[PDB]
Amino acid sequence: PVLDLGALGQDFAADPYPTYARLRAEGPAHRVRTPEGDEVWLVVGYDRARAVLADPRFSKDWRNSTTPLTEAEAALNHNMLESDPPRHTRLRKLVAREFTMRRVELLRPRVQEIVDGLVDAMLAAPDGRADLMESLAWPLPITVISELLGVPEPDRAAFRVWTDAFVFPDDPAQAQTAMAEMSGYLSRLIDSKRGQDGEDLLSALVRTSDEDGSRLTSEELLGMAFILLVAGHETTVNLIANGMYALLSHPDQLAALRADMTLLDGAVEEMLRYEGPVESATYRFPVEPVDLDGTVIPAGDTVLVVLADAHRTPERFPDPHRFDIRRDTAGHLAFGHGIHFCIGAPLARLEARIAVRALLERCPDLALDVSPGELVWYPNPMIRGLKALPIRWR
Numbered sequence: 001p002v003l004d005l006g007a008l009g010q011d012f013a014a015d016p017y018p019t020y021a022r023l024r025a026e027g028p029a030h031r032v033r034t035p036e037g038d039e040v041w042l043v044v045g046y047d048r049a050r051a052v053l054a055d056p057r058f059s060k061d062w063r064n065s066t067t068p069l070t071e072a073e074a075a076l077n078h079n080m081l082e083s084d085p086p087r088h089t090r091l092r093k094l095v096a097r098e099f100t101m102r103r104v105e106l107l108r109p110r111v112q113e114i115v116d117g118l119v120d121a122m123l124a125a126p127d128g129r130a131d132l133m134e135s136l137a138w139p140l141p142i143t144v145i146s147e148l149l150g151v152p153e154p155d156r157a158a159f160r161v162w163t164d165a166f167v168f169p170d171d172p173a174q175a176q177t178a179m180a181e182m183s184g185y186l187s188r189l190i191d192s193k194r195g196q197d198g199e200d201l202l203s204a205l206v207r208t209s210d211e212d213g214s215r216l217t218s219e220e221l222l223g224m225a226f227i228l229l230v231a232g233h234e235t236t237v238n239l240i241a242n243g244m245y246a247l248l249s250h251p252d253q254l255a256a257l258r259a260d261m262t263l264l265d266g267a268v269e270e271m272l273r274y275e276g277p278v279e280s281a282t283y284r285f286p287v288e289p290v291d292l293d294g295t296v297i298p299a300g301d302t303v304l305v306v307l308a309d310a311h312r313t314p315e316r317f318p319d320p321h322r323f324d325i326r327r328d329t330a331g332h333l334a335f336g337h338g339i340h341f342c343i344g345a346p347l348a349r350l351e352a353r354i355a356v357r358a359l360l361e362r363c364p365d366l367a368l369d370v371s372p373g374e375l376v377w378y379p380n381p382m383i384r385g386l387k388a389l390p391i392r393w394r
């Protein structure tokens with residue numbers, strides 16, 4: 001049959017893992033209906049999930065999908081995430097050097113500065129309470145990626161409104177309106193860099209496209225700007241929030257990290273394994289019918305790799321539901337796997353490591369200001385993210 005995820009209510013949004021684990025027990029592939037009404041396939045189980053992410057039979061070119069793209073969706077579709085070789089190879093080569101570890105390490109001073117200033121403005125609240133989402137989890141990633149690509153400061157507020165319509169559309173028409181508004185603005189921002197001799201990443205991409213349209217088309221230029229700004233911000237925002245929630249709702253681990261701050265990098269890794277921002281990888285389409293343990297997914301269907309279930313598979317991560325910052329986290333799929341492995345992983349780790357360190361080093365007696373049952377999770381089956389994260393200190 002077809003399992004409707006919308007009928008499971010907020011209980012699925014708050015804790016989807018028992019539902020995924022129930023499906024993994026009976027097989028790897030399952031037809032489900034998303035809470036928004038889409039019939040997709042769910043791929044569960046760590047071994048199957050890791051394999052499907054790197055399987056060329058599961059394509060990312062929407063030309064291989066039977067699902068139609070709206071005009072607004074198609075306008076931002078020409079990006080590396082929604083591509084197979086050789087288009088994916090060509091597009092990622094354009095910006096790969098900008099996101100290496102050695103190049104991202106050069107941003108560490110500025111990242112620390114952005115974090116230090118946001119922590120200051122948070123600690124200036126008189127009642128000693130704040131929403132960590134609004135005060136640090138959102139401002140930090142959007143500021144870093146905006147300075148890298150050259151988005152003016154007055155333009156960054158509308159990006160939260162737009163991605164708020166992506167992750168949680170009050171009505172599907174609002175997400176479409178946000179996509180057209182973003183597509184129009186990005187085209188205006190691209191045009192504004194032309195001939196201005198800017199040295200930001202978008203200015204370099206505009207010049208690259210103007211010099212040789214075959215290396216980077218104007219649609220691919222728009223798509224590149226789109227994917228770099230959206231895929232960077234949203235996931236990093238939720239990683240900071242999901243991870244601080246994990247530390248504050250597991251006080252023994254917070255104390256262990258406070259005792260030995262060399263476990264910081266391992267704690268962030270387990271943050272990604274325990275409550276990674278990506279619940280399911282982006283849409284994949286089989287170019288031919290694929291047989292998964294007697295279950296045959298037809299060509300062109302929408303396949304969702306449930307990364308969250310892969311991280312709760314006990315044969316790969318023993319005691320999966322335990323948040324252990326000393327755990328062996330090697331081989332998690334939080335950043336994906338294969339040719340589409342997150343190009344922003346070094347930058348995201350740098351942002352998360354500095355943010356978590358600054359919060360703990362500056363604010364002892366930091367605490368969650370609500371009960372874990374009071375937190376609200378977004379009903380998006382693709383995103384594991386909170387509406388807010390109330391905290392208090394001193």
Ligand code: HEM
Pocket residue numbers: 053080081082092145227228231232233235236237239276277278281282283333334335336337339340341342343344345347348
């Ligand atoms: C919390 C941190 C992050 C997480 C968990 C994350 C997660 C992911 C995942 C799972 C994928 C592969 C999706 C798929 O296979 O369906 C991906 C791809 C991608 N991510 Fe991220 N990401 C993060 C940070 C970033 C940042 C900061 C940037 C931008 C600077 C970024 C840009 C991209 C791009 C461009 C791709 C497409 C790569 C390609 O197709 O080769 N990500 N990310």
Ligand SMILES: C[As](C)(=O)[O-]
Pocket residue numbers: 152155185188189190192
């Ligand atoms: C800074 As603009 C894209 O509104 O010209």
